[PDB]
Symmetry: D2
Subunit: 116 residues, 4 copies
């Protein structure tokens, strides 16, 4: 798994389950092209977004749909979503974990980048 997303809920102390995630990749014309999407599992994890072959060098945006997550719990949150934008694989293939910790008016995000 070259790219994994993990989402946690800071209000409930739980994984954030069924969170929609959309990944885009910047194209040659500077537009964002759809690249992959999915939703988090019962463990707050989203695996299988892409493959080693498909995950080439580029600028990627990981959009986490936090607003829909909170609304389903009856909370009206501040943000529309949480976006994570980064250059990937420009020094060769790496494994990326994008983690986010969510609250209704705040979020934290970090990356764990490893060389296989």
């Amino acid at each position: 798994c070259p790219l994994m997303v993990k989402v946690l809920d800071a209000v409930r102390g739980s994984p954030a389950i069924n969170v929609a995630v959309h990944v885009f990749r910047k194209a040659a014309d500077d537009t964002w092209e759809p690249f992959a999407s999915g939703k988090t599992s019962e463990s707050g994890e989203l695996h299988g977004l892409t493959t080693e072959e498909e995950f080439v060098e580029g600028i990627y945006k990981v959009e986490i749909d936090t607003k829909s997550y909170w609304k389903a719990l009856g909370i009206s949150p501040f943000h529309e979503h949480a976006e994570v934008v980064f250059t990937a694989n420009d020094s060769g293939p790496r494994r990326y974990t994008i983690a986010a910790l969510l609250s209704p008016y705040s979020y934290s995000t970090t990356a764990v980048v490893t060389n296989p």
Copy 2:
């Protein structure tokens, strides 16, 4: 001052000074149009971005140029920038502070919304 942005450095324990910040408002065609911008002060703060009259309900994006900040310090960072996207809502008098706490591979952001 209906909108203020505050940026802090989690590595050095200081305000993040001279950081470029751009604010955009979502247009009817779903495109991001420039709304306001500036550079954070010595206290890591950016004031005077807009006025009560101009800051109507809508979807706004605050883009913080974190990459340039870390590069200026010789530190290789993860993110191209930090983006904060939110809806402004009229529900009594509201002032919005968007705060961001920066590290090379991580950031936190919160909103402090007061009367």
Copy 3:
């Protein structure tokens, strides 16, 4: 004001008001002796804890009563309190702001140390 404490609420997007805060200084016997305390203001801030003369180098603990804050809101929290333990060091004129951003099962804290 060599030491200020600022507490924010990540659930409601507001200052955390009327939060009890206790500051301790580590004694020679390795026990925590009370140093200063108060309750955060309407802006989530606690000023006037100490003076330049009293705030000497040493190890300090700031304890924030997060549990009472969440209980007052009907929310069951994880932590008994939030504790921030640090050394004050003389290295030119320093002012310390200890900030904390609170959620029911999580908190972030940072130090803003300036001249």
Copy 4:
């Protein structure tokens, strides 16, 4: 594993490896008694601190030695350590993950609490 600790490094974008962790439990006389200790692995995880039988109801403190971690990397950090204090198992047995994300002048901590 009723109690696990996970530590991440926000400067390097990596697990925080070889971080010392000490767990204490409040005794009847209100003193902190040593309960368990260990250090994080190459994945930033610390498993096997305790057992279901030993991890009874109580108030626990998890002390993460962040200062020693940073000093070994040549950084002089702000905090002495990061402390996490919580009541455990007072509504019956739960599984606890205590996570922390570290920077030299800041840290974030969250808990993931699950019912097996």
